Design a protein around this ligand. Structure first.
Ligand SMILES: CCCc1nn(C)c2c(=O)[nH]c(-c3cc(S(=O)(=O)N4CCN(C)CC4)ccc3OCC)nc12
Ligand SMILES: [Mg+2]
Ligand SMILES: [Zn+2]
Length: 322
């Protein structure tokens, strides 16, 4: 259970990495593990002078703030999203486009984007008057929280992995990370899809994309991490079904919490009524495919592989409904 880990890590730069396998061969530290692997592969610890033991201790601690008892939003998902972002950042069509600071930001954001997630939605927290909804005034409650926890763990010197960055670089990195994580709030999905469509319709090239200013670059990065977040169904069917099983256990866990309390249960989180299979088809047709077809458009043909699989998996789930 150490050579197996290195064998699985050869696919670090591939969509086909199996994060459940690395979780198993890493003594259940998939996020610490994958984040160290990625930072080395990109020479980020050297480029930004991050001490290796500082990095390990931060990551072990960030990972410890992902809850083991939530089915989906644990450190396995942060790891999956970080690694998925790492791959999209290498898409040939975006080759030389982002600074190393922008690259650092995207990967760090992916790693923290769901830290301390309680396993319930923004809507539940708001309708139960939770302390978190009061803190954040019902706006992007969880996403604001995830950013707060992530940045709060940097406050201590033994853990400030951004210590040797310029003062200006910490401000831009912080502005960028805030922007990317807030962009994972699913109630911003349509707003993000619309803007991504506008950039496809006005795209320049060389065959590498032209992004004139910051507003363009961070708008791609927001959509990248959102795509990474919502990339489960574009993975090979074996992985996608494990993710489907996790997310649905979590959602049914929440509908049970809604039933215990007499509030109305949303059809999709109802374990007595809801079809797992039909809800995945709907999830794909109305959210995931519209988004990944557009991302595919922006980077074509780099993402055509992902789009075929997405479509294949979609058809597999459709033909599992009676
Ligand atoms: C119903 C789709 C189930 C599902 N499978 N997978 C793999 C995912 C996923 O990665 N994300 C989400 C997801 C969906 C919404 S949703 O907007 O489609 N939606 C809100 C209203 N409820 C009642 C249902 C879900 C909101 C947040 C999510 O995950 C955290 C980012 N759902 C699934
Ligand atoms: Mg989230
Ligand atoms: Zn997420």
């Amino acid at each position: 259970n150490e050579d197996h880990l290195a064998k699985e890590l050869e696919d670090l730069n591939k969509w086909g990495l199996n994060i459940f396998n690395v979780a198993g061969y890493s003594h259940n530290r998939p996020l610490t593990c994958i984040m160290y692997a990625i930072f080395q592969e990109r020479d980020l610890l050297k480029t930004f002078r991050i001490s290796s033991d500082t990095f390990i201790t931060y990551m072990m601690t960030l990972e410890d703030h992902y809850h083991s008892d939530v089915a989906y939003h644990n450190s396995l998902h942060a790891a999956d999203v970080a690694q998925s972002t790492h791959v999209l950042l290498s898409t040939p069509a975006l080759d030389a486009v982002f600074t190393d600071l922008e690259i650092l930001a995207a990967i760090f954001a992916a790693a923290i984007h769901d830290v301390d997630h309680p396993g319930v939605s923004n809507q539940f927290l708001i309708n139960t008057n939770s302390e978190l909804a009061l803190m954040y005034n019902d706006e992007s409650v969880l996403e604001n929280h995830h950013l707060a926890v992530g940045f709060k763990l940097l406050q201590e010197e033994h853990c400030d992995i951004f210590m040797n960055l310029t003062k200006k670089q910490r401000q831009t990195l912080r502005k960028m990370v805030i922007d990317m994580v807030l962009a994972t709030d699913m109630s911003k999905h349509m707003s993000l899809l619309a803007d991504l469509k506008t950039m496809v319709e006005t795209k320049k090239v060389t065959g590498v994309l032209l992004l004139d200013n910051y507003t363009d670059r961070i708008q791609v990065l927001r959509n990248m991490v959102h795509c990474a977040d919502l990339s489960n169904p574009t993975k090979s069917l074996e992985l996608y079904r494990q993710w489907t099983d996790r997310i649905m256990e979590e959602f049914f866990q929440q509908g049970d919490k809604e039933r215990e309390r007499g509030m109305e249960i949303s059809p999709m989180c109802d374990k007595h009524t809801a079809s797992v299979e039909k809800s995945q088809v709907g999830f794909i047709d109305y959210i995931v495919h519209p988004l990944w077809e557009t991302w595919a458009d922006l980077v074509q043909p780099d993402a055509q592989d992902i789009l075929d699989t997405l479509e294949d998996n979609r058809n597999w789930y459709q033909s599992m409904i009676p």
